[PDB]
Structures are given as structure tokens and as C-alpha cells.
Amino acid sequence: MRVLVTGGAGFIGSHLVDRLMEEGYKVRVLDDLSAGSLKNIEGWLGNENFEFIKGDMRDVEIVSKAVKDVDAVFHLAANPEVRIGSQSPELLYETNVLITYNLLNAVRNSGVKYLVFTSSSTVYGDAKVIPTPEDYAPLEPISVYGAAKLAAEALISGYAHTFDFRALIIRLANIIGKRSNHGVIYDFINKLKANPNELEILGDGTQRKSYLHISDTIDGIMKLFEHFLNGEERVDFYNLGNEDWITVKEIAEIVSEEMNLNPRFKFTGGVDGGRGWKGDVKLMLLSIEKAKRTGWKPRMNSYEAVRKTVREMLE
């Protein structure tokens, strides 16, 4: 089986590439390195089962070529920066709706049999049912990013039914670990690297969300993928997150602890009710009963995930 991994030179994408290569798949990565890096996958360059394609998925010919001789696609290429939605929604539209559409047009007339998509908890919006289940509705995303992720999901479903392939949609919580160049942990580490006396924390520090270490995330994506392949569902929806959640204040405390620092916390107060930025969901915790029915469970909770992530990053 050949599997294409868009965004495979990124954080989640590079870890999933590691896993796919170790399990013996033929892996083709398509990445424009706008955010990713060859350092994330240099261990695999030159492997007789590995191909790298430096390309922007806006380029429709590149995408058509990438899906050639591919039996499965893992579509992780995206701009995952919620914060930019208020200032640059077109960027999010291009990196979440447009290139997904391009992928689907290419997949349409191809031998691609399976399409796996890393969606986001942000599709649930400010969810009123917590833990949020896969069947929560109406879906009312509050950010351009979450809206774009939901749009991608919808297109994937329609194309899967119209053009006879199968789609696995996995709505991930906040995923953290080594190689990430986005997110609160990364920014706190750099902030304290620049000034260890004072740390600016966006919002009111109470934003509370479920964090999943990348190890558990790849394990989950793979067990879900396997179970999906063995089923008949044309399109299936799974949450992937942790059992618990944790606040931004506590994350700041862990980041400080691990760096043997003692900054003053300076909260900005945020916007729209203590949010870090327009569209920042304040409370997120996904239900993972459906995924647990595959034999998957987080080996770490959110606190352990955060602490391991900080230590990994510092090395």
C-alpha cells in the first residue's frame, strides 16, 4: 500500500510518517515546507519506500501527480493557526478549504481508496455539551479556522459518496509534542527564552482544553485507520483527545517549572470574554468513547502530556 501524507514534513505529519514507515507502508510526502522542515523527516530521505515532493497544494498539477499510484491519502496539510483568522482569513481558507478541494478533485479520478483527514475540535464551536460527542450539533464554529475545517469535512464526505472512496474524519483536540512550531507551549518557551522575568499570557488564563501528546495521537490515528479499513462505513467520524483538560495558567506554571524559571505572569485579559483572540474557544474536551472502542486510550493525561512536551522541546 502506498499512502500519501500531505503536510508530512510538519509536526503531526512527520510523526505519522515515522509510524507509517516503521509499519512498512510506502509513504509519499507532499509538503511546501511553508511550516514544515526536512529536519522533521530527514531520517527517511532516500529510503526505498519513501518519496518527498516539495509542492504547494494550491498547484493543481502537483496535487494530481502526488496522488498517482496511491491507495490511501492522509491529508494533514493546513495552516493550523486559529489566531490569524481575524486578520488573515483568506490564508486559512486557502490552506484548509481550497487545497482540500484540490486534493479531492485529484483523488476523484484516481485509485485512491481511503482518505483520512485531521479535522479539529473547533468544528464544535463553543460546545454546550462537554465531553463533546461526535454527534453534537448544530455545528457552529466561531473561528475562520474551525469553519474552514468543517468545510473541508463536508467536501470530503460529498466526494467520498459521489466518487466511491471511503473517508475517515478524525477531530483532534490540542495535539502537543516534539517538532511543533505552533501553540501555547512553544510560545511560552520562546517568551521565557527572551525574558525569564515576565510571561505574557493571552486571555484570562482560564481557557481550559484537552491536550493529547503526539505519541498517543499517532497511536490513535493508526488504530482508528485500521478499524476503519476493516469496516464498511463510507464516512466515519471520530474524536481524538484526552480524558481530562487543563488551563492556560497551569500550562504556564508547568512551562516555568520545567525551565527552572520564576516569571511574573501578566495576563492580557483577552477579548470576547477572556479568550486569547477572536475565535479562541474557551472550553474544550472531546468524548473519546467511540475511539476507545478500538482498544485505544491515552497513555498520558493532559498534565503529563504538557510536561513531557516541554521537556522534549527543551532538548
Ligand X SMILES: C[C@@H]1O[C@H](OP(=O)(O)OP(=O)(O)OC[C@H]2O[C@@H](n3cnc4c(=O)[nH]c(N)nc43)[C@H](O)[C@@H]2O)[C@@H](O)[C@H](O)[C@@H]1O
Ligand Y SMILES: NC(=O)c1ccc[n+]([C@@H]2O[C@H](COP(=O)([O-])OP(=O)(O)OC[C@H]3O[C@@H](n4cnc5c(N)ncnc54)[C@H](O)[C@@H]3O)[C@@H](O)[C@H]2O)c1
Shortest Cβ 260–ligand Y spacing (Å): 27
Residue 162, interface with its own copies (CB under 8 A)?
yes
Bridge partners of residue 171, in order along the sequence? 119, 239
DSSP 271: B
**Contacts for 74 with CB less than 8 Å, ≥ 6 apart:** 3, 4, 5, 6, 8, 13, 16, 20, 116, 118, 221
Shortest Cβ 135–its own copies spacing (Å): 4
β-strand 264-267 against 198-201: which pairing, if any? parallel
> Nearer Cβ to ligand Y, position 36 or 298?
36
Pick from ligand Y, its own copies, ligand X, none: which does 202 bind, CB < 5 to 8 A by kind?
Answer: ligand X
Picking from 154, 119, 122, 174, the residue whose alpha carbon sits closest to that of residue 302 is 174
Contact 298, 233 (CB under 8 A): no
Residue 105, interface with its own copies (CB under 8 A)?
yes
> Nearer Cβ to its own copies, position 44 or 101?
101
> Nearer Cβ to ligand Y, position 36 or 270?
36
Picking from 130, 122, 128, 32, the residue whose alpha carbon sits closest to that of residue 82 is 122
> Nearer Cβ to its own copies, position 36 or 203?
203
Pick from ligand Y, ligand X, its own copies, none: which does 57 bind, CB < 5 to 8 A by kind?
Answer: ligand Y
Neighbours of 144 (CB within 10 A): 23
Pick from ligand Y, ligand X, its own copies, none: which does 209 bind, CB < 5 to 8 A by kind?
Answer: ligand X
| Sign of the CA dihedral running 19, 21, 27, 33 | positive
Q: Position 25: which residue type?
A: Y
Residue 151, interface with its own copies (CB under 8 A)?
yes
Helix (H, G, I), strand (E, B) or coil at 266: strand
Picking from 25, 66, 68, the residue whose alpha carbon sits closest to that of residue 44 is 25
> Nearer Cβ to ligand Y, position 118 or 143?
118
Shortest Cβ 309–ligand Y spacing (Å): 11
Shortest Cβ 68–its own copies spacing (Å): 20
Interface contacts to its own copies, rule CB under 8 A: 85-86, 89-90, 93, 97, 101, 105, 108, 123, 125, 134-148, 150-152, 154-159, 161-163, 235, 237, 278-279
